[PDB]
Amino acid sequence: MIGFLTDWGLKSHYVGVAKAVIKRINPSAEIIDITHEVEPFNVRKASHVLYRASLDFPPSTVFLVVVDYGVGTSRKAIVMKTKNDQYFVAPDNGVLTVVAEEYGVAEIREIENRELFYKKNPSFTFHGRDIFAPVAAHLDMGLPLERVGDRLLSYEVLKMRKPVVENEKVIGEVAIVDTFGNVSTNIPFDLFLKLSVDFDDVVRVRVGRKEFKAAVAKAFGDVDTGELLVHPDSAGFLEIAVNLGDASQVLSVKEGDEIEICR
Amino acid sequence: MIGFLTDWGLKSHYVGVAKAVIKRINPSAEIIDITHEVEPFNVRKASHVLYRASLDFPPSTVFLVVVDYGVGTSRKAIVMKTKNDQYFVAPDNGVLTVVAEEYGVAEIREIENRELFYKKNPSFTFHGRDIFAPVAAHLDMGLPLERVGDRLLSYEVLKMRKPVVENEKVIGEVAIVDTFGNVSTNIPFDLFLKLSVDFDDVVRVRVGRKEFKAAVAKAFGDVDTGELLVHPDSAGFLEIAVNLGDASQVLSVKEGDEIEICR
Amino acid sequence: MIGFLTDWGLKSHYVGVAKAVIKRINPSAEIIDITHEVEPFNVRKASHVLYRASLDFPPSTVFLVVVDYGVGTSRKAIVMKTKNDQYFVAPDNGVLTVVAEEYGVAEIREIENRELFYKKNPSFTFHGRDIFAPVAAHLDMGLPLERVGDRLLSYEVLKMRKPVVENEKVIGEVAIVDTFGNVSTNIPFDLFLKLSVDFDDVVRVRVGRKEFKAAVAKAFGDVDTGELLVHPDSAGFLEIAVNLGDASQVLSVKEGDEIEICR
Numbered sequence: 207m208i209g210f211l212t213d214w215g216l217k218s219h220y221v222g223v224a225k226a227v228i229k230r231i232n233p234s235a236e237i238i239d240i241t242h243e244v245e246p247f248n249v250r251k252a253s254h255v256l257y258r259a260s261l262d263f264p265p266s267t268v269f270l271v272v273v274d275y276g277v278g279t280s281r282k283a284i285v286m287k288t289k290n291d292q293y294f295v296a297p298d299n300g301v302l303t304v305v306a307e308e309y310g311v312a313e314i315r316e317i318e319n320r321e322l323f324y325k326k327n328p329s330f331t332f333h334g335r336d337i338f339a340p341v342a343a344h345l346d347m348g349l350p351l352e353r354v355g356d357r358l359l360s361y362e363v364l365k366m367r368k369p370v371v372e373n374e375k376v377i378g379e380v381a382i383v384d385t386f387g388n389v390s391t392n393i394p395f396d397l398f399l400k401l402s403v404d405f406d407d408v409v410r411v412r413v414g415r416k417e418f419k420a421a422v423a424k425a426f427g428d429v430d431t432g433e434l435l436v437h438p439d440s441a442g443f444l445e446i447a448v449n450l451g452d453a454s455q456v457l458s459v460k461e462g463d464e465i466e467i468c469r
Numbered sequence: 470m471i472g473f474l475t476d477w478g479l480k481s482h483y484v485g486v487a488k489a490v491i492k493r494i495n496p497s498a499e500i501i502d503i504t505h506e507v508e509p510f511n512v513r514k515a516s517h518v519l520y521r522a523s524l525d526f527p528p529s530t531v532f533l534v535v536v537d538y539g540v541g542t543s544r545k546a547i548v549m550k551t552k553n554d555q556y557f558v559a560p561d562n563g564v565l566t567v568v569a570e571e572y573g574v575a576e577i578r579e580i581e582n583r584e585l586f587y588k589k590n591p592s593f594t595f596h597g598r599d600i601f602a603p604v605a606a607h608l609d610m611g612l613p614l615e616r617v618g619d620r621l622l623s624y625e626v627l628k629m630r631k632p633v634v635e636n637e638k639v640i641g642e643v644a645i646v647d648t649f650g651n652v653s654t655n656i657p658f659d660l661f662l663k664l665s666v667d668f669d670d671v672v673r674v675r676v677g678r679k680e681f682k683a684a685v686a687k688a689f690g691d692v693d694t695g696e697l698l699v700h701p702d703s704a705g706f707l708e709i710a711v712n713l714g715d716a717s718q719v720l721s722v723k724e725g726d727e728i729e730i731c732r
Numbered sequence: 733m734i735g736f737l738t739d740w741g742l743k744s745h746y747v748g749v750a751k752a753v754i755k756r757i758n759p760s761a762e763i764i765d766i767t768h769e770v771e772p773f774n775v776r777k778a779s780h781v782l783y784r785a786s787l788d789f790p791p792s793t794v795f796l797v798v799v800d801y802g803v804g805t806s807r808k809a810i811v812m813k814t815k816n817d818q819y820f821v822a823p824d825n826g827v828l829t830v831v832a833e834e835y836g837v838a839e840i841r842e843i844e845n846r847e848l849f850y851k852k853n854p855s856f857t858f859h860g861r862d863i864f865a866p867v868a869a870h871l872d873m874g875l876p877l878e879r880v881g882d883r884l885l886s887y888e889v890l891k892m893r894k895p896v897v898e899n900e901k902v903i904g905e906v907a908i909v910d911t912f913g914n915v916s917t918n919i920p921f922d923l924f925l926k927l928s929v930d931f932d933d934v935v936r937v938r939v940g941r942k943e944f945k946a947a948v949a950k951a952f953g954d955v956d957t958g959e960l961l962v963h964p965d966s967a968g969f970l971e972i973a974v975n976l977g978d979a980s981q982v983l984s985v986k987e988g989d990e991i992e993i994c995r
């Protein structure tokens with residue numbers, strides 16, 4: 207199957223024409239949308255969503271990742287194969303930073319084989335359709351990785367500050383605010399569990415000049431409605447939520463904001 | 470096929486990872502999205518959308534319904550088989566109230582068979598992925614209903630006031646406001662047709678302290694642009710619309726608001 | 733495959749029930765969404781999106797186009813076969829104006845064969861589900877075009893002013909503003925290239941009483957961030973964009989607005 211992720215939105219016909227290209231190459235391709243609502247040009251956001259979503263895709267899944275503000279420039283077009291046997295077709299702009307780091311990379315190929323393109327003359331601003339999508343289609347059909355082009359020994363990396371436990375607390379950043387307003391961080395719940403806390407315990411959440419108390423819970427329903435809670439989200443990351451409410455609003459925080467969890 | 474309905478939104482990667490789980494279990498599963506834009510935690514809204522959409526799905530369709538604010542709590546996870554031979558995989562929070570009432574229930578099973586789960590250790594807040602979705606996948610693949618777990622003799626019901634015809638009028642509630650602003654009620658068009666009215670007749674619509682006149686019509690185009698009309702929507706429910714306009718705005722009404730249709 | 737385009741939105745269960753009808757008729761149907769976010773009743777917008785998207789669909793693709801404010805009225809329901817061998821199932825309201833003009837029409841059939849319908853008694857306001865969708869399904873399954881109904885010798889056309897090159901400049905209109913804010917016109921990039929301009933050249937963009945200078949470029953990245961550029965979009969149309977910005981905001985323009993490109 208193909209894991210599809212972009213910042214194109216579902217309003218435009220872009221996603222659709224990309225899917226038609228894939229289907230023309232391989233009518234049996236299974237295209238699963240991770241999301242096409244990554245904020246415009248937000249590769250950082252895509253890098254996290256990509257990793258988190260990939261955890262539930264099987265090995266040998268071909269990911270088509272296109273948040274590519276540098277489309278048509280000298281930036282490289284690449285295919286990365288990670289050590290957990292997954293493949294990623296994307297621009298070399300750092301969007302594959304998280305999967306590379308978390309999974310480790312087995313090999314990287316630069317997209318050079320023009321026989322794999324949709325059109326002999328690729329448009330300058332829509333490689334998603336003319337290059338990436340058709341390459342993902344071929345790979346998902348069984349094209350050997352080496353037929354993509356030459357190997358690359360390096361790739362662009364996005365700078366990321368690794369969250370740590372210092373002085374009974376863990377400092378991190380808001381990685382993703384979902385539609386419910388839940389606030390997921392880049393702080394692994396295992397790391398948090400190093401402050402020697404446990405479910406039913408109460409901790410402190412510091413955002414900006416604000417400080418809140420919050421129960422460590424398993425389910426939203428574990429606290430009264432409207433109350434705050436700290437818990438492991440579906441991907442193993444520490445998330446702050448308001449039971450039947452919007453934590454992003456209560457905390458008044460946005461993606462990228464620094465967050466501190468104190469015992 | 471699988472009818473998929475949630476309040477997760479399409480912006481998050483949630484819908485996607487759920488679909489990947491289904492596809493991993495059964496690559497041939499046909500997943501049709503009813504909608505993933507039910508307002509957060511709005512089971513009432515989902516219960517109506519579910520019923521209305523189910524009318525066009527064939528018998529033996531497996532519905533995956535996940536608007537589950539009580540995820541991870543003692544609330545039961547169930548599979549309901551209705552008398553029209555459709556199946557519903559959902560939380561026992563009343564979201565299956567309308568199909569149960571309208572179709573009648575043949576049997577209910579509590580989800581207990583852990584061999585049907587996606588993960589041996591289900592996350593606390595995303596049973597949609599770890600329990601419901603994989604159970605729907607197995608059922609759609611032909612798993613006998615009894616393999617799901619033990620039978621249940623009752624289920625949670627949402628309180629709903631049945632609309633009636635009293636004194637040349639029918640009182641009801643706004644069930645769904647669609648993207649055009651059309652205002653669909655919970656009033657069956659057949660019931661309305663008891664006030665001895667007919668197409669081309671004019672009736673009165675009362676909302677709040679407001680009263681409007683509206684023609685009973687078949688098509689929006691049956692009245693001048695901007696005019697109000699009362700008609701049967703695609704599911705047989707009385708709906709109020711503005712031809713080439715937004716009735717929710719003109720009436721200034723929202724879902725749940727009481728509505729009165731007077732001869 | 734079936735190219736699906738409507739103004740129904742993805743929030744409602746409408747798109748879903750239409751897809752279930754198609755799948756019931758032909759479980760092997762490949763439904764590719766072009767977009768369901770065309771503004772309500774905006775056939776003009778749909779006519780352009782349709783054409784632009786069709787360029788990447790293969791010949792023999794069956795397009796299901798339903799932006800039908802006149803649903804249930806005397807307006808005809810038709811199937812148009814163009815000279816590039818594509819088929820379009822739609823209301824005869826002018827939504828097929830652009831493909832007809834650009835591709836030329838080989839034949840038009842009025843939908844008359846009721847054996848092709850979803851329901852013996854079609855709803856008055858949702859022919860998308862009861863007539864169009866099932867007809868598209870049958871055609872995609874191989875139903876000969878003549879079985880649809882009698883031939884029609886004419887069809888509704890939307891009035892459109894053809895952009896031209898007069899006095900070193902080209903006047904046109906904004907056809908589509910995408911999610912990035914890019915401003916695509918109805919001006920073919922080939923026509924623009926008649927003003928004897930070339931990449932790296934600078935031209936003038938006139939909107940309203942405003943005038944801007946903009947570089948003619950290939951990729952957004954070809955200019956500094958925040959700068960304006962004129963380039964050919966993925967469909968060959970002249971588009972104005974802001975590198976890593978929103979041109980619709982900078983120009984303060986909307987679809988339908990007249991635009992002038994001066995040497």
Ligand SMILES: Nc1ncnc2c1ncn2[C@@H]1O[C@H](CO)[C@@H](O)[C@H]1O
Pocket residue numbers: 212213214246247272273274275276277331332333334912914952953973974975976977978
């Ligand atoms: N105005 C723009 N400036 C820079 N990049 C853009 C712009 N519009 C679209 N893109 C990029 O084009 C890519 C698709 O080819 C998208 O991933 C998007 O990030």
Ligand SMILES: Nc1ncnc2c1ncn2[C@@H]1O[C@H](CO)[C@@H](O)[C@H]1O
Pocket residue numbers: 386388426427447448449450451452475476477509510535536537538539540594595596597
């Ligand atoms: N902050 C929250 N409070 C209560 N329930 C939530 C919250 N966020 C998500 N959910 C529920 O989690 C379910 C998916 O596991 C969704 O159906 C949603 O209703």
Ligand SMILES: Nc1ncnc2c1ncn2[C@@H]1O[C@H](CO)[C@@H](O)[C@H]1O
Pocket residue numbers: 649651689690710711712713714715738739740772773798799800801802803857858859860
């Ligand atoms: N209030 C309305 N007035 C006119 N047309 C409408 C209205 N609501 C929905 N439609 C049309 O119904 C069609 C689907 O049957 C849509 O394409 C839409 O354009």
